[PDB]
Design a protein around this nucleic acid. Structure first.
Lengths: 326, 78, 326, 78
RNA sequence: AAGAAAUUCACGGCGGGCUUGAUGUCCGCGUCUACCUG
């Protein structure tokens, strides 16, 4: 009775746009309209080999001429402007409604169950601290991923717009906010009251974000790389394709979701160490870890696999409902 | 197996021509210098041909390594 | 006496064009002439593991390396413009005549019968509420399929043209119209009076539709995907081909028909829950369901299989005649 | 004869793999879902092999159904 | 040394993912000589 779905799939509510990096000077911070985009340059490298050898079986004449030579390739490394101190990241993340109304329903009884569970976990557990996870661990600008490293002051300006007009205009300073523990902020509770007005289906909400890392002049970045699968043979020159919008430098939405999908310290191992990206199987791509392994019971794919039969997770539900928000 | 010198300052792809001799022929196994997985090789006569058709390919300088690499990687000889 | 046809086939009256998405700004809504098309971009993803794994025979060390690694792939996600708020869908659905005049007649007596049934169900049952199903459940813009999700205001402008001139010029607001129940609208009765003047063979009718979802800036879409059958080996990079017109992004007419083929809540199970696409066997492709199964008698292929002998369906005829409109 | 599930969302040709069991072996009769005329099948061991070599064929996703279909239709086993 | 043959009727592909990490391309170099846009 009431088996699991044969094929379930949920829409990514709480969506995310692309970023267009563009560079600015402070006290010209407010006038970010004619701020020019940052073209992915083409540096042309040469190096040595820091990648080690394979330790099984060798011939010793290889490695000397291996190390001594030059791996001189071209590398499309996006670089800042000459006389620009600030930065830019223009992303309208719009939050969809319907936290657990599905997109595929391989059994309608399971859909009535899961709508019952959005009714419970949206009726009982208020989304105050829930969206305080999706804001207080994404206003502290994990938005800006590797370019967050040693900013002077990375200022986030989450404007919010009905229309061409914009009413919710909240400004921040994301270096005054940690990335390991969410601390009590009033305006962060306003923004989480607004994502409260988003995920529980109250209003059209698209948060136009304009993050300004005030780091320095011509320094490098952390733009999202493309790939070199069957394109390292026709060109065979580039090795790091920093991906582009029309004439600018992307941050791919794929990276941009674990800026905000980094929610739960509700994992198995850590206490205040690691706040990973709230996923099915909770796997971070960096560490090659599997937080919340199969043998543990903190899977997303054990949260309705137990909750759809026995109704007990008890506030690890949030890392089993936010696995369904995206 | 009976390894000798390269062809002139790989890389540009982390890929190399990496000519090394066989007891009768000479293999030209286009390969990485890191973990070791190669792409298709080509077996032919001695070094006296290897520099001959290697110099017989178009481009100048590094482009001879690269056009030689694409020429070997679409190989005929298994 | 009067057996069924050995091979019957009917033309898709009430045809449908392709969509060319193109992006705009509001108060420049009226001037959608030089509005640029939206090229299918190419993002490049790194994967994770959200898929559940098998329960028959395993070894628990496989997910350490699998859940470790990155089966990364390229995805051609069609993305909006930078500073464009609106959207676009230009489709001239033209309605053909001859609601049941066939295209193949494997027995002419069955053709005389079915022309008799278009004579009955077009003479007795007036197509007022019929085309009110093909309008009031396709002006509420199920036209725009997945891109309907959380629009600010998805405005449909069904212009209608004799010629280069256009007389029937009706404008809407498709967020004020539901997708589960058709409610009483006067201009919707004008448009259904016009499809009354279409299916009953009165005039040349091609409805140039221009739907404007006013959602946001650079957000994603729901353009119709192609396939990767024997093309994921030569290229072996892409995994979602968003299909193209000449330089734009399609919505394939195949998806575009169950925008308007979604007619009948006249199924077996639901009451006001599911308004599926009116088909033979009434199968929706999402849910893997078979509403109106073989053992039930709400098939299209039991509507002339009973009506061609015994003349009694009694107003479930509409889900057995609209199965013949397309 | 003792019918079980498919292989993963036919079609793409109106053709299906349509695995169904026998009392000892398991037949994999590549067939239509309409009138019923099949193309060549293949008889082998249980489902534990069926998913094994079915996952052992190239391509990703639907191409495994298609390359499995072409692999069964040029059969060896009558 | 072939000559005629209505292959057509219609058809939701979507569902979600951090590519990443790091790098000396340099070293030399006579373009070349003259010439009615009628």
């Amino acid at each position: 009775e009431r088996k699991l779905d044969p094929s379930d799939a949920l829409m990514s509510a709480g969506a995310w746009a692309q970023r267009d990096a563009s560079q600015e000077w402070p006290a010209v911070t407010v006038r970010e309209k004619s701020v020019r985009g940052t073209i992915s340059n083409r540096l042309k490298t040469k190096d040595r080999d820091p990648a080690k050898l394979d330790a099984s079986i060798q011939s010793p004449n290889l490695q000397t001429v291996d190390v001594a030579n030059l791996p001189s390739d071209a590398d499309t490394l996006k670089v800042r402007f000459t006389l620009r101190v600030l930065g830019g990241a223009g992303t309208p993340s719009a939050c969809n409604d319907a936290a657990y109304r599905d997109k595929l329903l391989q059994t309608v009884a399971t859909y009535v169950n899961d709508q019952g569970f959005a009714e419970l976990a949206r009726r009982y557990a208020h989304n105050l601290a829930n969206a305080r996870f999706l804001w207080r661990n994404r206003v502290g600008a994990e938005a800006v991923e590797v370019r967050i490293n040693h900013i002077r002051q990375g200022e986030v300006a989450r404007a919010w717009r009905f229309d061409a007009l914009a009413i919710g205009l909240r400004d921040f300073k994301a270096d005054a906010e940690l990335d390991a523990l969410a601390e009590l902020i009033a305006s962060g509770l306003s923004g989480s009251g607004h994502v409260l007005l988003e995920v529980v289906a109250f209003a059209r909400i698209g948060d136009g974000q304009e993050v300004f890392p005030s780091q320095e002049l011509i320094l490098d970045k952390g733009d999202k790389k493309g790939q070199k699968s069957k394109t390292l043979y026709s060109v065979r020159d580039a090795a790091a394709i920093h991906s582009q919008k029309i004439g600018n430098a992307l941050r791919t939405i794929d990276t941009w979701y674990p800026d905000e999908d980094g929610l739960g310290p509700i994992a198995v191992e850590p206490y205040g160490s690691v706040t990973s990206q709230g996923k099915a199987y909770r796997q971070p791509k960096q560490k090659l870890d599997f937080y919340t392994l199969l043998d543990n019971w903190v899977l997303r794919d054990e949260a309705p696999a137990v909750e759809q039969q026995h109704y007990v997770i008890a506030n690890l539900i949030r890392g089993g409902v936010f696995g369904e928000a995206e | 197996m009976k390894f000798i010198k390269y062809l002139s300052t790989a890389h540009l792809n982390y890929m190399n021509i990496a000519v090394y001799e066989n007891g009768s022929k000479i293999k030209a196994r286009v390969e990485n210098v890191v973990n070791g997985k190669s792409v298709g090789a080509r077996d032919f006569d001695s070094t006296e041909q290897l520099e001959s058709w290697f110099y017989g390919l178009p481009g100048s300088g590094l482009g001879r390594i690269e056009n030689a690499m694409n020429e070997i990687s679409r190989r005929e000889n298994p």
